[PDB]
Amino acid sequence: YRARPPPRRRPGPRWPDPEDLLTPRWQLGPRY
Amino acid sequence: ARALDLLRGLPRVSLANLKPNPGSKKPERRPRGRRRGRKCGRGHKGERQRGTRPRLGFEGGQTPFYIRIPKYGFNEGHSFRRQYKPLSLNRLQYLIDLGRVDPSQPIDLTQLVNGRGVTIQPLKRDYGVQLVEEGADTFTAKVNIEVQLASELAIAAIEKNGGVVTTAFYDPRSLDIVCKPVPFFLRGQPIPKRMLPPEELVPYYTDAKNRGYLADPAKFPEARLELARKYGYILPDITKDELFKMLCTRKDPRQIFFGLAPGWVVNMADKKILKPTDENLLKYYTS
């Protein structure tokens, strides 16, 4: 069997949706 | 080898041929049977098995030992007491012989902690490292060691061989970046300017005998002369050697690295170094 693809981090930054409450606020802040 | 030539004749290893080192995993002993099952090692009758024993350090109504002893100022303000990690010039001689830190360049707490000479725990309130007199013999470092605290014998031994000693104070958040700057470089903020020493260590860092970075350079020849006069050793004027400029490389206050300065933002991915180039921002970072 072909192995499942290797787990790799998200290429490029991770910009969550600001109008999305389950996303915590520290991502929206300038420090992130 | 005698190990491998057995395995080629011996059968193949699998889960069935697998076993740990005997003596590592001792077998669990549960209270079921005749031996343990009766009382399970809890006693016959009393709080021991009922589970209502008193707390630890209880004397059955009698005053515990820990209350009958009076209070005294043993460890008060221990979260603000003065702490520094030792460092022996024996180790400095050892580490340069290993070649992890180069004496050709100026030695620093960064070059030290990059060499893993000694760990440092800035959140455990240790504002640097001190020199230790243990190791006066067998020392030919000739390095420009940067330190926070220093002993008299360590300074005399280093100056005898032609090295340079100097104290430089760091704040808590100014030190953790010093001992480990790269994660702050993953943040992108500007590196912060250092501060002056607190309201009690200023006489130390202003004195010339302990090589204070606030003290004048004019007084260091006097302190050098007295140490040579004290411990009876020639005073090698280090102006002769070609690398005299390297030995006198020192950082002014409110600057971390000899190259970098406060306000200078640094980047590694798509490597770039940036300035504010605003009059209000620039003139404060100098301050």
Partner: protein
């Protein structure tokens, strides 16, 4: 806000950054090096065994305390015939104590376990032999 860029200052960043491999130490003109350091002789001596150095190119002799009274010293990485090595140290430490040592060996891990601290004696013994 404004920002102006520079790249000439990048050399200071790499002098600041650490390494990830222990560098081979400098070839000092004078031996034995200060701090009691001495690299292993080259070529090694042909023997039934050999003792390698550690990550810091030190001797793999260590001490240990157990039960508050087990005051022993250990060696970690014996390679080859351990029975030849343990016989040598037994004859070496015999006249010091007046009795043959009753030490323990584990040829699986290639380790030794000797009662009493003799690290300074074993270090000089392994250095003069060239391990």
């Amino acid at each position: 806000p404004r920002f102006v860029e520079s790249v000439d200052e990048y050399q200071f960043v790499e002098r600041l950054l650490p390494a990830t491999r222990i560098p081979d130490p400098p070839k000092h003109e004078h031996y034995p090096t200060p701090s009691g350091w001495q690299p292993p002789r080259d070529p090694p001596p042909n023997l039934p065994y050999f003792v390698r150095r550690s990550r810091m190119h030190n001797i793999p002799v260590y001490k240990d305390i157990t039960h508050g009274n087990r005051q022993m010293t250990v060696i970690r990485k014996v390679e080859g015939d351990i029975w030849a090595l343990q016989k040598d140290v037994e004859d070496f430490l015999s006249p010091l104590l007046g009795k043959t040592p009753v030490t323990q060996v584990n040829e699986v891990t290639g380790t030794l376990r000797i009662k009493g601290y003799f690290d300074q004696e074993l270090k000089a013994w392994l250095l003069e032999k060239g391990f």
